[PDB]
User: Which sequence fits this backbone?
């Protein structure tokens, strides 16, 4: 009802939606395969500065993201984390770096991003290489649930607000079929999701990579969709 | 350019685009899988009445389509053709029929729609049962190129304006991967596309089922995508 949709967001623009105190999602609309969809990332306040989760796909959009943050929040983004290596999550990293933002990702993501020719976050996030690994990063906890949408995908939990951002490892309810699974691990995706359920059973707000937020139901929904795809179809 | 996009068209709204004298396309935005795509159909003037090609997917959208035609063109829609049996092309037939529009489709389409529990056009178009078959239908020529997006898909040519509408058998250039192919004949799709090229080499405007129109280049693009999907990209 209040959450921004593609109808409110022209391609190239960015909206912010405050989930809780000091926690926002940033929403940007992207063109793909001739379709337009809303892409989610996360913003989390940390003291008097901001932690960014994922870009807005590309230089232009990521510049628009920084401008929307300054307009609505007005605190500096000092650090940024990319949840996996695909261009829509690391695209814009160069703009962030040039603006003075410290960019972060796992060695797995940086590795894969380089092979793909994508932009590469400067700093490496250690202690996330094994499935089930969790590390604290300021106002959030980074978690590697195992392979799913990609072998390197991370999810982000904000303990102060009980917010779980799943990136493309989590589907919105409106998504009834599998998205881009070229780099996915269909055999492991359900198991990885269950690691998330087990580790964050208290989560109250779940943010999918694309589309509308919900509750923990989005996990079982995603599993249902992934399994249906596996059985083809 | 100037062809309308999803941004200019809110969900549930329909816009018309004049391609040539007495030849429009109608564009409606649909939400599917959490993404929004712009869906094309055709409108061809025949004397002092109009020929409609395909609905706007759904009773509501099709009602809006009839309202937009009435507002912009102000000539009665007396006949309608659905190009294949899927709900986005026959969904709205009941609204059209209630509005006094004579609805048409091949016997193949009507049977497949009935099996699927979709709305069924009243009239049966004979002479389109075998690949390469063409028949005249007022100001257009209907053509069955053979199985492609579906076993029953038709394409429509307007000889007056050299406009070719291919429905979901033709992809826009922005579409790099196969869309819904559950009911498609991937094996025959390239061969059917070549029948269209052979039959309408003089086509100047080519309208894909979804998205931006182009030239005959759209044909080879579609084949390339289909063959890649066959070999699994
Ligand atoms: Cl630093
Ligand atoms: Cl730095
Ligand atoms: Cl009738
Ligand atoms: Cl009649
Ligand atoms: O992605
Ligand atoms: O379709
Ligand atoms: Zn991805
Ligand atoms: Zn640094
Ligand atoms: Zn179809
Ligand atoms: Zn009749």
Assistant:
């Amino acid at each position: 009802g209040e959450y921004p949709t593609v109808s409110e967001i022209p391609v190239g623009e960015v909206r912010l939606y405050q989930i809780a105190d000091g926690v926002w999602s940033h929403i940007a609309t992207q063109s793909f395969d001739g379709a337009v969809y809303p892409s989610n990332g996360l913003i989390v306040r940390d003291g008097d500065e901001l932690l960014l989760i994922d870009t807005a796909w590309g230089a232009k959009n990521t510049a628009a993201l920084l401008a929307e943050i300054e307009k609505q929040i007005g605190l500096p983004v000092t650090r940024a984390v990319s949840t996996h290596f695909h261009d829509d999550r690391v695209g814009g990293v160069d703009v962030l770096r040039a603006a003075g933002v410290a960019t972060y990702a796992s060695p797995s993501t940086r590795r894969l991003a380089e092979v793909e020719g994508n932009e590469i976050p400067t700093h490496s996030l250690e202690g996330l290489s094994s499935s089930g690994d969790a590390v604290r990063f300021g106002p959030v906890e980074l978690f590697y649930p195992g392979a799913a949408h990609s072998t390197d995908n991370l999810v982000v939990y904000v303990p102060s607000a009980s917010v779980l951002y799943g990136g493309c490892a989590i589907y919105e309810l409106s998504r009834t079929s599998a998205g881009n699974v070229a780099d996915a691990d269909l055999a492991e995706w359900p198991t990885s999701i269950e690691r998330i359920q087990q580790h964050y059973p208290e989560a109250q707000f779940v943010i999918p990579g694309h589309g509308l937020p919900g509750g923990l139901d989005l996990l079982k929904h995603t599993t249902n969709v992934v399994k249906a795809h596996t059985n083809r179809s």
